[PDB]
């Protein structure tokens, strides 16, 4: 059966980490890591999370199966983080949430479920979008198309090209958005923008699906949701996929969730059942541990408070490198403008650099950057900034 | 989009636990639980697991993403538990293992991967088989057919009907087996039986896929694998799906794994890549926590030793109820033979009882049993045995 021909031509992971895992001089990391790193290059484990990890060592009584949808507390908790405080979408019971081996879990689960119950044929992702997007959905047998976004050149969102690319879409078509700023270039629709996508989105069909990892990394836990929230001001039907993998620095635990909305609660229920349908058919129920950490930090408001400050730290270091990058680059000699990298959000941004600068940087240079010129601001530490910036400007 | 018609007609879970969750007199549990219970009706959390849970509170340095295949230690460790000690299938590097949100995760992942790379069209499950089997594979677009097994009446494996039902199968068809004794009736092929399935299996085509949750519950960690192992003595190509969900009482953590075999290591590799392919496309990498517990107990041989004794306990309580069931039933008045329930293995066995005894037991009786007459020996405690056995014999 497996004997003769298969093999991968694979993901931009070992597509950079393994040459890094060998191409040893004093390698300026990959800026092609997918995780955050602190001022020392470590991707710590959090005080809010540990303290919470301990609350579980002691309080757990059984490792008894979780409900298909998971931890309801996590539920309440996730819902309220995405839609708000007195959110009339919560009291009103239009939203239902599933706990999933998070982020990708949710987009998958979202995928498999749309694929029946629904007659969604295509998914519109965005050029570029997080690399693993296409695979999730092709896997489920939905065809993926791309809308414009960052035509680049002038480093911002070619708003017009988007709207323009989008009109090709249609009524029962799902349009994938990243709530708060986009992997790989933290370029944001401003509220207005977010606002018109929504006006357009209702008058044309489009079930909107939010891909939401990164909340609290652009401006703040609650502002980051505004995009999700205005859409949500006017949808009836909407679906969002979340991850506490980045915001809780819980990467390996696999935490995130899938929220589904319907006009009303009866409808929400006939459909959530069918999303649970798709869950018993994937993995029968989600992994507790991560989410309990999660459910526990969001409930304990002392632990929340301590948790909100770490994230603040995160997000802040990230902001500090973005200026420093542009600064160390001034001083050292660059023929260009990159004042565009302090304008973007998140870990990611494309360093406007060529497939070949990117490659002239891994020879007698040593910096790892995935071929697309995309760097992870998070891998830049205050001291590695010197050499990095020598190297970047020694190619332009 | 979701508006009008969907809804579930669902899993034998709330299909029994929810009426239990309400039908309150002194309800004799459901014997329609899917988890083990101790002599008090609790599904504890283990000393081996806690001690290990603590080793992690203190030793974890980052929550950094796991490899797609997961924890390699878990790897080594799982492989050696399934195939053995000096296993020439390990040194020989024909086996490769993926860590997955376990058990169902693995059958799914196994499913999605067969579905391309391979030209497996059908899956042969067994009548009955674990209820969630059909959904996993239909979900992936493989058609499921059933082979005979327990025609019942004479409570044992209609060996002949199996062989007989099987011949309809064919060359690139996957045949699903439960390594050590079967959910819902712990009826075993003896080594010989296991042995002929294998002889047959090579001479006819059939990629064999083992569904293996329950190891150490029939006779012992190592004997339970004999079935897996003799097949494995002669396959080249074979695939097994595991779960430490029952044996480690880790139910909610989601621990298990998918082992794939090929004739040789080159071939194993072109295909594992494509199984990792299917993994980045499901959830991008598995949840650490559970498996670290797992990887940690199997390496630390003090913790292993302590772990092997709990399981022994488990398996033993399970054996003690099976005799007690048959005994309390003698004494109290039954018109039948049920000496067949001390012959079976595992938590499960069908109490030869009718859809209507099953139902005459939930009226002014109070015992919950999924309509198929299947009981979970594990929910029977030494004291609830009195009333249960009054009730069972008061209907025959
Ligand atoms: C980081 C990220 C994810 C993460 O999915 P998880 O399994 O939560 O790691 C998903 N989508 C996007 C756009 C991301 O940036
Ligand atoms: C219990 C059981 C499973 C469990 O899958 P998990 O997700 O590990 O709970 C799978 N298959 C069979 C036959 C089982 O009995």
Nearest ligand to the CA atom of B345: 2
Would you say residue A5 lies in a domain? Answer: no
- B210 forms beta bridges with B177, B240
In ligand 1, the atom with minimum distance to the C-alpha of A256 is 8
State the residue range of the domain holding B383.
Answer: 11-44+316-396
CB A264 within 8 A of CB A273: no
Of A78, A144, A66, A146, whose CA–CA distance to A111 is shortest? A144
Distance CA(B250)–CA(B105), nearest Å, equals 14
Would you give the distance in Å from CA A93 to the centre of its chain?
Answer: 26
Whether B160 contacts B238, CB under 8 Å: no
Closest Cα partner for A260 from B3, B104, B136?
B3
Residue with tokens 């959090």: A46
Residue ID of nearest Cα to ligand 1 atom 13: A130
Instruction: Verify whether the Cβ–Cβ distance A42 to B35 is below 8 Å.
Output: no
Asked if residue B141 belongs to a domain, the reply is: yes
| DSSP 8-state secondary structure symbol assigned to residue B216 | T
Mark yes or no for CB contact B281/A108 under 8 Å. yes
Confirm if A311 and A145 have CB atoms less than 8 A apart: no
CATH number at residue A349: 3.90.1150.10
Nearest-CA neighbor of A266 among B4, B18, B8?
B4
Q: Is the same domain home to A155 and A260? A: yes
Q: What is the CB neighbour count within 10 angstroms for residue A132?
A: 18
A324 min Cα distance to partner chain B (Å)? 26
Q: Which residue has the tokens 């009718």?
A: B354
CA distances to B34, B219, B367 from B39, rounded to whole Å, are: 16, 20, 18
A255-261 and A95-101 as β-strands: parallel, antiparallel, unpaired? antiparallel
Distance from CA of B2 to the nearest CA of A (A): 6
Strand order in the sheet with B122-124: B95-101, B255-261, B238-243, B207-213, B174-178, B122-124, B143-145
The answer to whether residues B29 and B177 belong to one domain is: no
Residue A104 CA, ligand 1 centroid: distance in Å: 6
Buried-state track A167-193, b at ≥16 Cβ within 10 A, e below 16: eebeeebbbbbbbbbbbbbbbbbeeee
Give how many domains chain B has, as a whole number: 2
- Please provide the distance, in angstroms rounded to a whole number, between the alpha carbons at the two ends of chain A: 51
Rounded Cα distance between A115 and A119, Å, is 7
Nearest to A279 by CA among B132, B12, B86, B63: B132
User: For residues A281 and B139, is the Cβ–Cβ distance under 8 A?
Assistant: yes
Q: How far is B160 from chain A (nearest CA, A)?
A: 28
Same structural domain, A260 and A323: no
Answer yes or no: is A323 within a domain: yes
- Rounded Cα distance, B286 and B290, in Å: 10
**Are A302 and A321 within one domain?**
no
For chain B, the straight-line distance linking the first and the last C-alpha, in angstroms and rounded, comes to: 51
Of all ligands present, the nearest one to the C-alpha of A110 is: 1
Q: In terms of domains, do A195 and A52 share one?
A: yes
Q: Is there a domain that residue A4 lies in?
A: no
Note whether residue B217 is domain-resident: yes
Domain termination site, one of A285, A315, A345: A315
Which value in Å is the resolution of this experimental model? 2.8
Backbone angles phi, psi at A327, to 5 degrees: -75, -55
Are residues B272 and B381 located together in one domain of the fold? no
Between CA B36 and CA B45, with CA B42 as vertex, the angle to 5 degrees is 80
Give the DSSP per-residue string, B107-152: HHHHHHHHTTTS---EEE--SS--THHHHHHHHHT-EEE----B--
Nearest-Å Rg of the Cα atoms of chain A is 21
* Chain A residues in contact with B74 (beta carbon < 8 A): none
- Mark yes or no for CB contact B282/A237 under 8 Å: no
Tell me how close the Cα of B9 comes to any Cα of chain A, in angstroms: 9
Question: What angle is formed at CA B172 by the lines to CA B169 and CA B174, rounded to 5 degrees?
Answer: 65
Of the three residues B266, B285, B315, the one that is the final residue of a domain is B315
Sign of CA dihedral A164, A167, A168, A174: positive
CA distances for B377 relative to A274, B34, B318, B325, angstroms: 31, 10, 6, 8
The enclosing H or E element of A240 equals strand A238-243
How far is CA A178 from each of CA A135, A149, A253, B5, B64, rounded to the nearest angstrom?
17, 12, 22, 30, 22
The rounded radius of gyration (Å) of the Cα atoms in chain B is: 21
Query: Which residue is closest in CA terms to ligand 2's atom 8?
Result: B103
Do A63 and B250 count as a contact with CB atoms less than 8 A apart?
yes
Residue A102 Cα, ligand 1 centroid: separation in angstroms? Answer: 8
CATH number for position A109: 3.40.640.10
Q: How many angstroms separate the CA atoms of A390 and B108, rounded?
A: 49
The Å distance, Cα A240 to ligand 1 centre, comes to 13
Contact list in A for residue B270 (CB cut-off 8 A) is: 2, 5-7
- Measured CA to CA in angstroms, residue A230 lies from A199, A223, A224, A262, A380 at distances of 10, 11, 11, 16, 34
Any catalytic annotation for residue B246?
Answer: yes
Residue of A28, A37, A246, A276 with catalytic role: A246
- A28 and A56 fall within a common domain: no
Ligand 1 lined by A245 (C-beta under 6 Å): yes
Instruction: Bin A258: left if φ > 0, else alpha if -120 < ψ < 50, else beta.
Output: beta
Indicate whether A296 and A326 sit together in one domain: no
Alpha carbon A313 to its chain centroid, in Å, reads 18
Looking at B290, B315, B340, which one is the last position of a domain?
A: B315
What are the residues facing A375 on neighbouring strands? A349
Q: How far is the centre of ligand 2, averaged over its atoms, from the C-alpha of A330 (Å)?
A: 59
A151 catalytically annotated? no
**Active-site residue (options: B173, B246, B276, B307):** B246
Say whether A287 and B283 touch across the interface (CB within 8 A): no
Whether A76 and A100 share a structural domain: yes
Helices (H), B22-95: 47-59, 72-83
Could you tell me whether strands A174-178 and B143-145 are parallel, antiparallel, or unpaired per DSSP bridges? unpaired
Show the tokens assigned to A268: 């929400």
Which of A61, A102, A280 is nearest residue B11 as measured by Cβ atoms?
A280
Do B34 and B49 belong to one domain? no
Do B307 and B189 belong to one domain?
yes
Q: Are residues B35 and B56 in the same domain?
A: no
Residue A63: which of B207, B249, B282 has the nearest Cβ? B249
Q: Check B290 against A289: CB less than 8 A apart.
A: yes
A37 is catalytic: no
């Amino acid at each position: 059966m497996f004997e003769n021909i298969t093999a991968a031509p694979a993901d931009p992971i070992l597509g950079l980490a393994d040459l890094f895992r060998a191409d040893e001089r004093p390698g300026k990391i990959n800026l092609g890591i997918g995780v955050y790193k602190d001022e020392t290059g470590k991707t710590p484990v959090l005080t809010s999370v540990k303290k919470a990890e301990q609350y579980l060592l002691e309080n757990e009584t059984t490792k008894n199966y979780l409900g298909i949808d998971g931890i309801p507390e996590f539920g309440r908790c996730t819902q309220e983080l995405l839609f708000g405080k007195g959110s009339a979408l919560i009291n009103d019971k239009r939203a239902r949430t599933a706990q999933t081996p998070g982020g990708t879990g949710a987009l998958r689960v979202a995928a498999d479920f749309l694929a029946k119950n629904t007659s969604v044929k295509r998914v519109w992702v965005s050029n570029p979008s997080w690399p693993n997007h296409k695979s999730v959905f092709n896997s489920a047998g939905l065809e993926v198309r791309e809308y414009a976004y960052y035509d680049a050149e002038n480093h911002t969102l070619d708003f017009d090209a988007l709207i323009n690319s989008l009109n090709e879409a249609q009524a029962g078509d799902v349009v994938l958005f990243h709530g708060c700023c986009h992997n790989p270039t933290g370029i944001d629709p401003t509220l207005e923008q977010w606002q018109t996508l929504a006006q357009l989105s209702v008058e044309k069909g489009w079930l909107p699906l939010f891909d939401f990892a990164y909340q609290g990394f652009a401006r703040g836990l609650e502002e980051d949701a505004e995009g999700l929230r205005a859409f949500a001001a006017m949808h009836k039907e909407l679906i969002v996929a979340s991850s506490y993998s980045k915001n809780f620095g819980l990467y390996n635990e696999r935490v995130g969730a899938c929220t589904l909305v319907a006009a009303d609660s009866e409808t929400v229920d006939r459909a959530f059942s069918q999303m649970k349908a798709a869950i018993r058919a994937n993995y029968s129920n989600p992994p507790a541990h991560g989410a309990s950490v999660v459910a526990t930090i969001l409930s304990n408001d002392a632990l929340r408070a301590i948790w909100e400050q770490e994230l603040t730290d995160m997000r802040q270091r990230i902001q500090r490198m973005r200026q420093l990058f542009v600064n160390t680059l001034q001083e050292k000699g660059a023929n260009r403008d990159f004042s565009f990298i302090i304008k973007q959000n998140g870990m990611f941004s494309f360093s406007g650099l060529t497939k070949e600068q990117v490659l002239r940087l891994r020879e007698e240079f040593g910096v790892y950057a995935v071929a697309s010129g995309f760097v992870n601001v998070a891998g830049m530490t205050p001291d590695n900034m010197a050499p990095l910036c020598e190297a970047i400007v020694a190619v332009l």
